[PDB]
Design a protein around this nucleic acid. Structure first.
Lengths: 90, 87
DNA sequence: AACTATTTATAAGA
DNA sequence: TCTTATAAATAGT
């Protein structure tokens, strides 16, 4: 990036859409590279704010999702949590 | 990277494992940033070569997967396909 | 595991 | 979309 940007929701609609398209390609690209380099199985489902779907899966999506739903051990899972935060002085 | 690397399976076991751990964090990180920045719902399931699971989901994994299985329109889908290559 | 040069991604300005 | 300068990730150590 020509500038550092904060990680909060982009407010400009068209900016949000461009950022979405490029970052999504980059993310599927990094997913592909992870799967190849480290010999692992990835499935990546993305729904844009308008509920349109975009997906990546190394092997085969329904294979990976089946394996998921049957997996019955504790495992590393991360998520998004919203925090209350005070801003800078300005 | 201190070196450019080819995109093929890392042969050294321990190298593969370190690369896995760091790149996975980076990938979940970029996923989180995408979901926040562009207000979208992501689900990312990874099974390492030993069949151990690692996951990221912005909202809630079963929510996203339900939405997936019901989605009935054509959509952008990618996968990995193997190519023959000269050196 | 941390730290650093080299690469890979990406945001602003066009 | 493109260009470019800048920030962010990562491959070796």
């Amino acid at each position: 990036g020509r500038k550092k940007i904060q990680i909060t929701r982009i407010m400009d609609e068209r900016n949000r859409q461009v950022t979405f398209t490029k970052r999504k390609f980059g993310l599927m690209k990094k997913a592909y590279e992870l799967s190849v380099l480290c010999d692992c199985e990835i499935a990546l489902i993305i729904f844009n704010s308008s509920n349109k779907l975009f997906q990546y899966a190394s092997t085969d999506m329904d294979k990976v999702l089946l394996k998921y739903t049957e997996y019955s051990e504790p495992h590393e899972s991360r998520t998004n949590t919203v925090i209350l935060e005070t801003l800078k002085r300005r």
